[PDB]
Amino acid sequence: AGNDLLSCLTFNGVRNHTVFSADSDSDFNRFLHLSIQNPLFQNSLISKPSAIILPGSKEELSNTIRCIRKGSWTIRLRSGGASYEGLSYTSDTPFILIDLMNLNRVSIDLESETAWVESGSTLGELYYAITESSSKLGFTAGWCPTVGTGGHISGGGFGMMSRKYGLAADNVVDAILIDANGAILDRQAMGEDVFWAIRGGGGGVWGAIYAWKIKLLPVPEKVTVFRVTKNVAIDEATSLLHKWQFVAEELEEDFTLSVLGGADEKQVWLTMLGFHFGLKTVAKSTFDLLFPELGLVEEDYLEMSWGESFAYLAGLETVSQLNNRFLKFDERAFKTKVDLTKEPLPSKAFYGLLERLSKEPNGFIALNGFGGQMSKISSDFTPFPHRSGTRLMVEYIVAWNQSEQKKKTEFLDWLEKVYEFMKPFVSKNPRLGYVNHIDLDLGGIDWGNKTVVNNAIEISRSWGESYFLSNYERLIRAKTLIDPNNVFNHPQSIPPMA
Numbered sequence: 423a424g425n426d427l428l429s430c431l432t433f434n435g436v437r438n439h440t441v442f443s444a445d446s447d448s449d450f451n452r453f454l455h456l457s458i459q460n461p462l463f464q465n466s467l468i469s470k471p472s473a474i475i476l477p478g479s480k481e482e483l484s485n486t487i488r489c490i491r492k493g494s495w496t497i498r499l500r501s502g503g504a505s506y507e508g509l510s511y512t513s514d515t516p517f518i519l520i521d522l523m524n525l526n527r528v529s530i531d532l533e534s535e536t537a538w539v540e541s542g543s544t545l546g547e548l549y550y551a552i553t554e555s556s557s558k559l560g561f562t563a564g565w566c567p568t569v570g571t572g573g574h575i576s577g578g579g580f581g582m583m584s585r586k587y588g589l590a591a592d593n594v595v596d597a598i599l600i601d602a603n604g605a606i607l608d609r610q611a612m613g614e615d616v617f618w619a620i621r622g623g624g625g626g627v628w629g630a631i632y633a634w635k636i637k638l639l640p641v642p643e644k645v646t647v648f649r650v651t652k653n654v655a656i657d658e659a660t661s662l663l664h665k666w667q668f669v670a671e672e673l674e675e676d677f678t679l680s681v682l683g684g685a686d687e688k689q690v691w692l693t694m695l696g697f698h699f700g701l702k703t704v705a706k707s708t709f710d711l712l713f714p715e716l717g718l719v720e721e722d723y724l725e726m727s728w729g730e731s732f733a734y735l736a737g738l739e740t741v742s743q744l745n746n747r748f749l750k751f752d753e754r755a756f757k758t759k760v761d762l763t764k765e766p767l768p769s770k771a772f773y774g775l776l777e778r779l780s781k782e783p784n785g786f787i788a789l790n791g792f793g794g795q796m797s798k799i800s801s802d803f804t805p806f807p808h809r810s811g812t813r814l815m816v817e818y819i820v821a822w823n824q825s826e827q828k829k830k831t832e833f834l835d836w837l838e839k840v841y842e843f844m845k846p847f848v849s850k851n852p853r854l855g856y857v858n859h860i861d862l863d864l865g866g867i868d869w870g871n872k873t874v875v876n877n878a879i880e881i882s883r884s885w886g887e888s889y890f891l892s893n894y895e896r897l898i899r900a901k902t903l904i905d906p907n908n909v910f911n912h913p914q915s916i917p918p919m920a
């Protein structure tokens with residue numbers, strides 16, 4: 423029973439747990455909602471955990487998993503709670519939520535220039551700790567400070583420094599994984615196939631990552647960034663985006679130029695985000711040469727520390743704000759979809775995308791170029807396969823607040839239609855995806871369904887090959903090795919072999 427679970431936890435010295443309560447403002451509901459970053463999955467109709475456990479050490483994490491298995495609960499692991507589909511805190515079967523928020527220690531070793539990072543730590547907490555320790559070290563990961571390292575690194579982790587240094591997972595050199603039996607496994611213990619699989623094979627599949635050991639990377643004491651919003655009409659916005667794609671993928675590895683875009687009837691807005699590993703004179707000379715159409719001026723270019731640049735690019739007020747995991751931002755529900763491209767987008771693709779954005783001010787797009795180091799890493803170095811030959815990543819987002827809930831169906835329909843419009847221009851056979859941008863539209867396994875489970879491998883190939891391409895086969899072997907009994911599962915987890 424739940425009381426048996428409780429007894430087991432006590433016997434093993436795990437004290438931080440809270441059982442389900444109907445009391446709307448119970449401590450249970452407080453802990454549950456503390457790390458739900460998408461209000462979309464926050465209402466009273468959604469599944470709720472039977473209990474929430476907050477392990478405070480690797481042994482407590484090991485024993486929690488050990489105890490949960492003596493019952494029939496589904497395990498859910500949550501770090502940052504940023505899952506696009508709420509997969510860290512929802513389940514169609516009774517589940518126990520293992521919340522890792524107390525595992526938030528970052529330990530920087532300046533003598534080896536590496537760090538051990540407990541998996542409950544956020545990217546912001548990590549960046550803050552790095553900046554505090556050194557003005558010449560940084561790390562490559564995503565641009566959202568509130569995202570958890572647990573899910574993020576497990577899925578790869580792309581950001582503004584990836585053209586220089588690759589994904590967060592491409593820079594992991596050891597890890598502690600707690601397996602289905604509660605074993606505490608470092609890189610040597612888990613073996614090279616499993617150490618490969620965890621570095622981008624997706625969270626919630628292999629076991630519970632207790633901590634990541636990462637290599638810290640050189641950054642100059644001052645870098646140059648810009649964040650400039652152009653307010654233009656569609657003719658100019660189209661020509662800017664069409665040229666942007668070439669400038670972006672082609673830039674030397676020491677430069678990144680990304681875009682956020684949206685519109686409202688005749689007014690289009692494009693926010694250009696620039697990063698250069700170096701000083702402003704070189705930064706401006708490069709963009710003056712390659713992209714004069716942007717109309718950037720001297721005062722747009724800002725020199726600041728690496729830590730400052732990551733806080734700045736995230737729209738935070740100060741570096742100090744990096745260190746606040748529960749610092750919200752906005753309170754909007756959202757849905758997103760993503761594409762990867764292999765061929766240049768024709769001008770008419772950007773034109774049509776902007777036309778659709780112009781009709782839906784709640785929608786917007788995020789555009790990133792690959793190339794640089796992303797084209798120099800082999801497709802099977804880690805599970806993330808989209809390397810050489812991949813040109814852009816394109817994200818489509820629609821977001822709304824409480825007062826707009828009536829339009830929910832309308833927003834989702836808009837996003838569906840945008841995705842359908844882009845189909846001919848983006849990757850095909852299969853239409854590629856990214857596991858950190860998990861998308862349930864592709865389908866999902868009901869692990870309680872016998873006929874589906876028998877055919878799990880074929881069925882799962884739909885999303886599996888989209889996220890991992892030819893790396894799918896090795897992932898299945900790693901899964902069978904580390905979690906043959908499928909203790910760690912969700913609608914799109916890698917299936918073990920029968």
Ligand SMILES: *c1c(C)c(C)cc2c1nc1c(=O)[nH]c(=O)nc-1n2C[C@H](O)[C@H](O)[C@H](O)COP(=O)(O)OP(=O)(O)OC[C@H]1O[C@@H](n2cnc3c(N)ncnc32)[C@H](O)[C@@H]1O
Binds near residue numbers: 565
């Ligand atoms: C910005 C924002 C605001 C969001 C919401 C997502 C972002 C983002 N910016 C990104 C970026 O710049 N670059 C990216 O590559 N991705 C970006 N994303 C997506 C984000 O990376 C993913 O949502 C990421 O998976 C979130 O990680 P998280 O905050 O830890 O999310 P969850 O706790 O919901 O977990 C996700 C998934 O992993 C399993 N999990 C969590 N912790 C685990 C440990 N320690 N071990 C094994 N598995 C773990 C969860 O169970 C769930 O399945």
Ligand SMILES: *[C@@H]1O[C@H](CO)[C@@H](O[C@@H]2O[C@H](CO)[C@@H](O[C@@H]3O[C@H](CO)[C@@H](O)[C@H](O)[C@@H]3O)[C@H](O)[C@H]2NC(C)=O)[C@H](O)[C@H]1NC(C)=O
Binds near residue numbers: 437438439456476524
């Ligand atoms: C289980 O874990 C939760 C989350 O860490 C624990 O709640 C936390 O408890 C600490 C104190 O032990 C709180 O620290 C202090 O809170 C007070 C009041 O807000 C403040 O004055 C101090 O400066 C400091 O912030 C912390 O707020 C709190 N975190 C949350 C989110 O509630 C809890 O104590 C643990 N439960 C057990 C049984 O140990």
Ligand SMILES: *[C@@H]1O[C@H](CO)[C@@H](O)[C@H](O)[C@H]1NC(C)=O
Binds near residue numbers: 871872873874
């Ligand atoms: C199992 O899944 C299939 C396909 O999703 C569905 O048609 C069927 O009804 C399910 N079987 C049971 C008994 O739930």
Ligand SMILES: [Mg+2]
Binds near residue numbers: 445
């Ligand atoms: Mg009450």
